[PDB]
Design a protein around this ligand. Sequence first.
Ligand SMILES: NC(=O)c1ccc[n+]([C@@H]2O[C@H](COP(=O)([O-])OP(=O)(O)OC[C@H]3O[C@@H](n4cnc5c(N)ncnc54)[C@H](O)[C@@H]3O)[C@@H](O)[C@H]2O)c1
Ligand SMILES: NC(=O)c1ccc[n+]([C@@H]2O[C@H](COP(=O)([O-])OP(=O)(O)OC[C@H]3O[C@@H](n4cnc5c(N)ncnc54)[C@H](O)[C@@H]3O)[C@@H](O)[C@H]2O)c1
Ligand SMILES: NC(=O)c1ccc[n+]([C@@H]2O[C@H](COP(=O)([O-])OP(=O)(O)OC[C@H]3O[C@@H](n4cnc5c(N)ncnc54)[C@H](O)[C@@H]3O)[C@@H](O)[C@H]2O)c1
Ligand SMILES: NC(=O)c1ccc[n+]([C@@H]2O[C@H](COP(=O)([O-])OP(=O)(O)OC[C@H]3O[C@@H](n4cnc5c(N)ncnc54)[C@H](O)[C@@H]3O)[C@@H](O)[C@H]2O)c1
Ligand SMILES: CC(C(=O)O)C(=O)O
Ligand SMILES: CC(C(=O)O)C(=O)O
Ligand SMILES: CC(C(=O)O)C(=O)O
Ligand SMILES: CC(C(=O)O)C(=O)O
Ligand SMILES: [Cl-]
Ligand SMILES: [Cl-]
Ligand SMILES: [Cl-]
Ligand SMILES: [Cl-]
Ligand code: NA
Ligand code: NA
Ligand code: NA
Ligand code: NA
Ligand code: NA
Ligand code: NA
Ligand code: NA
Ligand code: NA
Ligand code: NA
Ligand code: NA
Lengths: 260, 260, 260, 260
Amino acid sequence: MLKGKKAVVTGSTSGIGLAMATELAKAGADVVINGFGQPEDIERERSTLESKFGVKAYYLNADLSDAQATRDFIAKAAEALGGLDILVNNAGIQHTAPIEEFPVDKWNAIIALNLSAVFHGTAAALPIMQKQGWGRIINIASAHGLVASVNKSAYVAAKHGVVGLTKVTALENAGKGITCNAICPGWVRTPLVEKQIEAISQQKGIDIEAAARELLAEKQPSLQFVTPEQLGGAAVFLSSAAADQMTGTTLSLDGGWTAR
Amino acid sequence: MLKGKKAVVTGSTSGIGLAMATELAKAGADVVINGFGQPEDIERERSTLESKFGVKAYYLNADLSDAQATRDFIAKAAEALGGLDILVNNAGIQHTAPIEEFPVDKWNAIIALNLSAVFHGTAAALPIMQKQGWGRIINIASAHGLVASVNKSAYVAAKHGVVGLTKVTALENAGKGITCNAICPGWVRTPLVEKQIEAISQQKGIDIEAAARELLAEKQPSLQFVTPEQLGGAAVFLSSAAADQMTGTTLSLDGGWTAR
Amino acid sequence: MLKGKKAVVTGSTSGIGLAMATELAKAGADVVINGFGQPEDIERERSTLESKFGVKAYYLNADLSDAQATRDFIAKAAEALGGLDILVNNAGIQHTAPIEEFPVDKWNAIIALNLSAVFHGTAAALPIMQKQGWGRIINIASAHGLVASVNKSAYVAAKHGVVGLTKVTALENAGKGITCNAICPGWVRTPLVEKQIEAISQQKGIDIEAAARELLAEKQPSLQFVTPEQLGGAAVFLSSAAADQMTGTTLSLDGGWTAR
Amino acid sequence: MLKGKKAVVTGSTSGIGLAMATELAKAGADVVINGFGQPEDIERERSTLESKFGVKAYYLNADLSDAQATRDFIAKAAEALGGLDILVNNAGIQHTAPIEEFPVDKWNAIIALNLSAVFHGTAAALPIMQKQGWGRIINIASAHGLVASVNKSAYVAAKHGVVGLTKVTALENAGKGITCNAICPGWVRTPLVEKQIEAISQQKGIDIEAAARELLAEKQPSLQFVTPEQLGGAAVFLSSAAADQMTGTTLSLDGGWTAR
Ligand SMILES: NC(=O)c1ccc[n+]([C@@H]2O[C@H](COP(=O)([O-])OP(=O)(O)OC[C@H]3O[C@@H](n4cnc5c(N)ncnc54)[C@H](O)[C@@H]3O)[C@@H](O)[C@H]2O)c1
Ligand SMILES: NC(=O)c1ccc[n+]([C@@H]2O[C@H](COP(=O)([O-])OP(=O)(O)OC[C@H]3O[C@@H](n4cnc5c(N)ncnc54)[C@H](O)[C@@H]3O)[C@@H](O)[C@H]2O)c1
Ligand SMILES: NC(=O)c1ccc[n+]([C@@H]2O[C@H](COP(=O)([O-])OP(=O)(O)OC[C@H]3O[C@@H](n4cnc5c(N)ncnc54)[C@H](O)[C@@H]3O)[C@@H](O)[C@H]2O)c1
Ligand SMILES: NC(=O)c1ccc[n+]([C@@H]2O[C@H](COP(=O)([O-])OP(=O)(O)OC[C@H]3O[C@@H](n4cnc5c(N)ncnc54)[C@H](O)[C@@H]3O)[C@@H](O)[C@H]2O)c1
Ligand SMILES: CC(C(=O)O)C(=O)O
Ligand SMILES: CC(C(=O)O)C(=O)O
Ligand SMILES: CC(C(=O)O)C(=O)O
Ligand SMILES: CC(C(=O)O)C(=O)O
Ligand SMILES: [Cl-]
Ligand SMILES: [Cl-]
Ligand SMILES: [Cl-]
Ligand SMILES: [Cl-]
Ligand code: NA
Ligand code: NA
Ligand code: NA
Ligand code: NA
Ligand code: NA
Ligand code: NA
Ligand code: NA
Ligand code: NA
Ligand code: NA
Ligand code: NA
């Protein structure tokens, strides 16, 4: 249980982050959610976190590609919650092209969100965690923070950067009651992956499900997707006392991707 | 909860393995324990697992440096339990000396227990897990399965070997309902470490506690020991559904050792 | 020998890059040099590459923190040389502070030079290498592309990013006659390190040389600096036929830093 | 040049080790060769090292699965050469089967040769290198010292062990003029691989060359074999002064295998 904890999840209006926020609320944490989407859907998400799980939930819209807006988001989140105990740096985007064709603005947008926002969000959260002597920073990296694939230069660079940044954060705060770790998923069937499944299905002249199977066979030896729910369980474990001496490391849920 | 699971923990009469067995029993698993020590202490351990936690517990004495005895141990364990769902390959030993002074019999004894027993125990358990379509093999490696220190050639080689073997096990059994992962602890204050603390305290002319502090400062940025209880929580997480797609990987609880 | 090769070295007016350019010229390559410094020193560097080693050398001033200026640099370099066979992405900077005190403009400046310039320079070079069916991209990462230290968040993140980017580059160009690898130095006594040695000497109240010794003892088990000359030899090896199937990897010259 | 160096190559009657011995002799080192094969072929190998390259060469038959015979081999090699400057621990074997079917005697034979012989050979060589203040120990690991594949439990465990052991060796001897590094090849078309190519060709009902292509496509993004000659060049580089601060690390020549 994380009863009375105060949690922030970036990019929690979809996908993995939505499951992060749900599992943390189900464990008893109050939660700040964040991200884009349809306003009616976001408010139903917010209000149902409260009505299902009996916690407080707040939605703060911030485009975390802007540094100042990320730092201001953290301050607003902490004010809403009355503190900040668990920060999940989750928001991220993907774009695929070979390096020489890779758009300079997509490189800049993936580095800004997928790497720099993790730095700015961490910097703004740390003093709150340091003054209270307890904290969790849970960065959502990827198998692509440890290995590469073709056509994903910006994303692999950003995610490797998040793994490095996670290690620094942990070393700087070692013994202070604060841990920092990176969850590194393999394929999870969210919209970020569905786009790639569709691009495959068109490239190969096959249906969507045969395309999902080929996606998995290429990288993920279990031939099964990792689920958002499993990922939210991993974050609940990282938040637990058993994980008090787990810091500066990666937690790979990837169906065997990085074992080969 | 792991209610009704059937677990085996090698080297569970002391240290980390004793905490493994306790936490698994507290989660509801029946447990086979194993290892050396004083018979009165071992039977009190067995019987109190049952009387505290309401599970069945069995002690099977096997010296796991013998291959056949390890394979026969697994069969006897499975017969006792009526199955075998979770295998914790934990038993291990340490010896410190520079390579050119390192005793050939201590190299052979550390490779036999710390590496080969993990192979023989896995081989004997696998067909039971494959026929039922579910399993957990949890190997206790070390930070020394990922990095090295001086004077620990056999142990670092064995533990690196266990990390490799964990990856193979996971790949061969990917998608079958069986996962295999390696818990990689930093310093944990058990008798295996207390001996090194004492050797330090004599080398340096200092008390035991100043020696423990120097041990930690050299390797473990948190300056705190990892606890057996924390480690048993990590094994309970690896045994959970959230970890169904966590396979072939290492889970480092090391206070930041391997982040630097 | 690399007789008739055409090489580009970013940040080759000092330090490691100057030795890169020297060793490549001594192997027979024509060389483009780049970086800041005193104009008289830069022209003496250029002209002495030619007069000592009998190659052609060109100095192209570009601030590689600007993306367009990096891409325009590569085109100008290729025009100067009449081709582009070996690209050494070396220019980089350092800044030390804890995360919550780390200046947002220094994060942006280290990501721009130490990571994004490697991407833009690679993107501009690749089509030249792809059309000729031969190439070397040699990225200068760091031990800090594989592990972390305190107070170096931007730099560790950038260098991890360069290791990821090196892997992508290599995978996208596998079998085309082009390799991409990352040289990962430990401490090398250049101005980037001398500043840290001086900061230590002031923190500790000791002379500069005792400070250099403490720098080395903390991280580098050999207790000796890696030299720029050794690093230029590593790049000459990466450029050789023996390294035709060495791609997507790191080459650590770090006195044992990353072995522990 | 390695003029006047004294080198030992285990398992140098075939494959990679034969190329190791050739390249070292071509650089000017005297060489001890070792391994099984037809006596006429071994003596022609020995004598042609001398007659082509003008060095001294000696053949010492030792089965390095025996610890004492490995230690006695090193002493005999050093007596032959009048010293011992470069030790290449290369001899190794492979066997493929799933873990539960993997023969206990093949596990023991792969651990004995592929791991323990590297320990015994290193232990016997070290005091000779320590007394002279210079040495190279070059261990031939594999991509399978860093990642796994199915059906190769003993070999992946042994090779991971060699990577760990390489790190210890380097740390214990850091700053003494002795380095220890692991060359980690991807696929190299020697008899050890030809057997696997043939097993594939039968499994799939295809010719030998289509089977070699499928072997490469599964693991090695360049779609080209690494050559023994390239590997001997890597060992000649590790033996050079440029590599004086390269210690405790892996040098991957694997066509991109471990980048993904
Ligand atoms: N899906 C996978 O297979 C997979 C695998 C490994 C890692 N990841 C990572 O998991 C994380 C979540 O991805 P997902 O798959 O759930 O994707 P998703 O697209 O379903 O969700 C992305 C979330 O981030 C938000 N977001 C996007 N741009 C933003 C911005 N500028 N500011 C604030 N919020 C922004 C979106 O609104 C959404 O809430 C990402 O960091 C991604 O890199 C995903
Ligand atoms: N303590 C640490 O800091 C630390 C750190 C990393 C990894 N480890 C690993 O954790 C595991 C447990 O170690 P620990 O610290 O709890 O040590 P411990 O000495 O307290 O316990 C070792 C257990 O193994 C048993 N054992 C020893 N030889 C055996 C044999 N031949 N057959 C069967 N059982 C045998 C012992 O009786 C005991 O039950 C080992 O694999 C060790 O390598 C420990
Ligand atoms: N010195 C070390 O211990 C060490 C260790 C590991 C990695 N590195 C890396 O080695 C590389 C070279 O560093 P060094 O130690 O030789 O440092 P240095 O300071 O001596 O040289 C830096 C070079 O980069 C140039 N440069 C700086 N900003 C630039 C810009 N915006 N555009 C173009 N050129 C620019 C400088 O003018 C100079 O030529 C860097 O990537 C650094 O991160 C150094
Ligand atoms: N070929 C590859 O693709 C590949 C890839 C990665 C690593 N490796 C490693 O490279 C090394 C050399 O393998 P190779 O492919 O050249 O194989 P190879 O079979 O062609 O040569 C093996 C050499 O070891 C000798 N040898 C075998 N058993 C021995 C024993 N008990 N004592 C002494 N010598 C013995 C053989 O006689 C022969 O000289 C091995 O360590 C292997 O694991 C090979
Ligand atoms: C696996 C998935 C990710 O890393 O986010 C991707 O490659 O897009
Ligand atoms: C940390 C502890 C271990 O790895 O078991 C040791 O080095 O003895
Ligand atoms: C070692 C040196 C570097 O990585 O550039 C530094 O930490 O500054
Ligand atoms: C690649 C080759 C090796 O590692 O020796 C093999 O897997 O057999
Ligand atoms: Cl790929
Ligand atoms: Cl050490
Ligand atoms: Cl540090
Ligand atoms: Cl495989
Ligand atoms: Na709280
Ligand atoms: Na940002
Ligand atoms: Na059961
Ligand atoms: Na055994
Ligand atoms: Na390390
Ligand atoms: Na040319
Ligand atoms: Na740039
Ligand atoms: Na000599
Ligand atoms: Na042996
Ligand atoms: Na991999």
